[PDB]
Amino acid sequence: FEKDKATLTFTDVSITVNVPTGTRIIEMSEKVGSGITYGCREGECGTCMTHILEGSENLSEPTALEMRVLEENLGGKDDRLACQCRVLGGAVKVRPA
Ligand code: FES
């Protein structure tokens, strides 16, 4: 009934925020103090890498750009870029990678 909102848990700070769907993880991490770093405005640096603990199915699929910057920065199977990863619904749990 609230399909336009999603819960996002930053486990390094133990807080779950209810975000409007389509919000990027980086747009909440600094609001709660999570240690995810915003280091560029072009999606190329990869310093915003984030480990997706749960709920990867509720996230926007990675673009070809994200995949390239992920691989360039040794991102793993469950890592995503916080400045490019949008929460589309459901429940997601993340920690700084
Ligand atoms: S902040 Fe640079 S890739 Fe996300």
Residue numbers in the entry: -1 to 95
What does the paper say about this structure?
Small electron transport proteins that bind FeS‐clusters are called ferredoxins (Fds). We discovered that FdC is the first [Fe2S2]‐cluster Fd involved in N2‐fixation under anaerobic conditions. FdC was shown to interact with an oxidoreductase of unknown function called FprA, encoded within the same operon as the gene for FdC (fdxC).
Additionally, here we report the high‐resolution (1.7 Å) structure of R. capsulatus FdC, the first structure of a [Fe2S2]‐cluster binding Fd involved in N2‐fixation under anaerobic conditions. The globular and monomeric FdC coordinates a [Fe2S2]‐cluster. FdC was found to comprise of five β‐sheets and two α‐helices, one flanking the β‐sheets and one situated on top of the protein close to the [Fe2S2]‐cluster. The [Fe2S2]‐cluster of FdC was coordinated by the thiolate side chains of four Cys residues (C38, C43, C46, and C81) in a planar fashion. Notably, a fifth Cys residue, C83, appeared in the centre of FdC, though it does not form coordinate bonds with the [Fe2S2]‐cluster. Only two polar residues (threonine 45 and glutamine 82) had side chains in close proximity to form hydrogen bonds with either the S2− ions or the thiolate side chains. Notably, this differed from structures of other plant and algal‐type Fds which rely on hydrogen bonds created with either one or two serine side chains to stabilize the active site. We discovered that FdC has many outward facing charged residues in close proximity to the [Fe2S2]‐cluster. To summarize, the spectroscopic characterization of monomeric FdC confirms the presence of a redox active [Fe2S2]‐cluster with a midpoint reduction potential of −285 ± 10 mV, which is unlikely to be an efficient electron donor to the reductase component of nitrogenase, including the R. capsulatus Fe‐nitrogenase system.
